[PDB]
Enzyme design. Structure first.
Site, PDB file in Angstrom:
ATOM      1  N   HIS A  40       0.780  -1.239   0.000  1.00 15.41           N
ATOM      2  CA  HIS A  40       0.000   0.000   0.000  1.00 15.41           C
ATOM      3  C   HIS A  40       0.825   1.309   0.000  1.00 15.41           C
ATOM      4  CE1 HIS A  40      -0.025   0.541   4.599  1.00 15.41           C
ATOM      5  NE2 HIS A  40      -0.254   1.804   4.198  1.00 15.41           N
ATOM      6  N   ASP A  84       0.214  -7.492   2.448  1.00 20.87           N
ATOM      7  CA  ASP A  84       0.650  -6.108   2.369  1.00 20.87           C
ATOM      8  C   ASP A  84       2.172  -6.019   2.521  1.00 20.87           C
ATOM      9  OD1 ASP A  84       0.564  -3.365   2.162  1.00 20.87           O
ATOM     10  OD2 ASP A  84      -0.450  -3.077   4.115  1.00 20.87           O
ATOM     11  N   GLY A 175       2.149   7.174   8.421  1.00 26.57           N
ATOM     12  CA  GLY A 175       3.518   7.559   8.080  1.00 26.57           C
ATOM     13  C   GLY A 175       4.545   6.569   8.616  1.00 26.57           C
ATOM     14  N   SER A 177       3.741   3.353   8.174  1.00 22.53           N
ATOM     15  CA  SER A 177       3.386   2.247   7.303  1.00 22.53           C
ATOM     16  C   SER A 177       4.570   1.829   6.446  1.00 22.53           C
ATOM     17  CB  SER A 177       2.229   2.685   6.433  1.00 22.53           C
ATOM     18  OG  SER A 177       1.193   3.216   7.205  1.00 22.53           O
ATOM     19  N   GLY A 178       4.800   0.519   6.339  1.00 21.44           N
ATOM     20  CA  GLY A 178       5.887  -0.088   5.598  1.00 21.44           C
ATOM     21  C   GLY A 178       7.106  -0.359   6.459  1.00 21.44           C
TER      22      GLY A 178
HETATM   23  B1  LIG Z   1       0.436   4.241   6.680  1.00 22.58           B
HETATM   24  O1  LIG Z   1      -0.604   4.471   7.579  1.00 22.58           O
HETATM   25  C1  LIG Z   1      -1.479   3.406   7.913  1.00 22.58           C
HETATM   26  C2  LIG Z   1      -1.623   3.067   9.376  1.00 22.58           C
HETATM   27  C3  LIG Z   1      -0.488   2.642  10.075  1.00 22.58           C
HETATM   28  C4  LIG Z   1      -0.602   2.184  11.393  1.00 22.58           C
HETATM   29  C5  LIG Z   1      -1.846   2.208  12.060  1.00 22.58           C
HETATM   30  C6  LIG Z   1      -1.950   1.718  13.383  1.00 22.58           C
HETATM   31  N1  LIG Z   1      -1.021   0.926  13.929  1.00 22.58           N
HETATM   32  N2  LIG Z   1      -3.004   1.989  14.156  1.00 22.58           N
HETATM   33  C7  LIG Z   1      -2.976   2.696  11.368  1.00 22.58           C
HETATM   34  C8  LIG Z   1      -2.871   3.099  10.022  1.00 22.58           C
HETATM   35  O2  LIG Z   1       0.005   3.836   5.390  1.00 22.58           O
HETATM   36  C9  LIG Z   1       0.105   4.904   4.477  1.00 22.58           C
HETATM   37  C10 LIG Z   1       0.693   6.040   5.298  1.00 22.58           C
HETATM   38  O3  LIG Z   1       1.134   5.445   6.501  1.00 22.58           O
END
Ligand SMILES: *[B]1(O[C]C2=[C][C]=C(C([N])=[N+])[C]=[C]2)O[C][C]O1
Ligand SMILES: [Ca+2]
Length: 223
Positions: A40, A84, A175, A177-178
């Site tokens: 993603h 993912d 932010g 994420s990944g």
């Molecule tokens: B990520 O954001 C998505 C994200 C990451 C972590 C949580 C969490 N642990 N509650 C929720 C949503 O993907 C695109 C931008 O950063």
């Protein structure tokens, strides 16, 4: 990272920032040529920034290396975020030193209760937004597949693990994420999703890296 602390500078030498003019996701260095992240977070151009602590200031440990190749999981579902995971081959090998190092892939899936380390430059507030310069860190346990399923009925595939605190207050966020979840020296998670951040009964959900060791080692061998 909500409810964390600022990492010691370069104590997380496998953490990368993915930059598209600015930071938008994290990733983990798993070979001198390969970073793993979340599907993603895919974009056609990514510059990988290694040896960061302050992503807003050059401190002299940084290696900025564009992606030569960006390969999403062939079965990544953009909707459920099942599988993912993506790999990024660097256009030159990263130099490995104390500040830029690889993280092992898992030799087994982690048990419930295993302490892990989660990092990134995602949002730090459970109320509003503050995106930090300095790399944040969070100690967090792996949660039961039962407890992860009770938090998110019918939403957790077998390619997903929860890691965090059912009470709230301590989680990754947008932010991050990944980026990595590392436990007993092995990359066991990739920051994937969650309902908001750091809410009660809504722990972070993370791609389950111990399901993907064959896929990763194959993609590396072929490219
Ligand atoms: B990520 O954001 C998505 C994200 C990451 C972590 C949580 C969490 N642990 N509650 C929720 C949503 O993907 C695109 C931008 O950063
Ligand atoms: Ca920097």
């Amino acid at each position: 990272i909500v409810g964390g602390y600022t990492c010691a500078a370069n104590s997380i030498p496998y953490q990368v920032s993915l930059n598209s003019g600015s930071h938008f996701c994290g990733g983990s260095l798993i070979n001198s040529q390969w970073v793993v992240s979340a599907a993603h977070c895919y974009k056609s151009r990514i510059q990988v920034r290694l040896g960061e602590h302050n992503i807003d200031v050059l401190e002299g440990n940084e290696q900025f290396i564009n992606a030569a190749k960006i390969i999403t999981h062939p079965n990544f579902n953009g909707n459920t975020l099942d599988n993912d995971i993506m790999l990024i081959k660097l256009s030159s090998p990263a130099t490995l030193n104390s500040r830029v190092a690889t993280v092992s892939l898992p030799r087994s899936c982690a048990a419930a209760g295993t302490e892990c380390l989660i990092s990134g430059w995602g949002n730090t507030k459970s109320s509003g937004s503050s995106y930090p310069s300095l790399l944040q860190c969070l100690k967090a346990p792996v949660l039961s597949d039962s407890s992860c399923k009770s938090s998110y009925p019918g939403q957790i595939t077998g390619n997903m693990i929860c890691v965090g605190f059912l009470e709230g207050g301590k989680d990754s966020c947008q932010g991050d994420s990944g980026g990595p979840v590392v436990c007993n020296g092995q990359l066991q998670g990739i920051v994937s999703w969650g309902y908001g951040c750091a809410q009660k009964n809504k722990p972070g959900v993370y791609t389950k890296v111990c399901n993907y060791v064959n896929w990763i080692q194959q993609t590396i061998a072929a490219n």
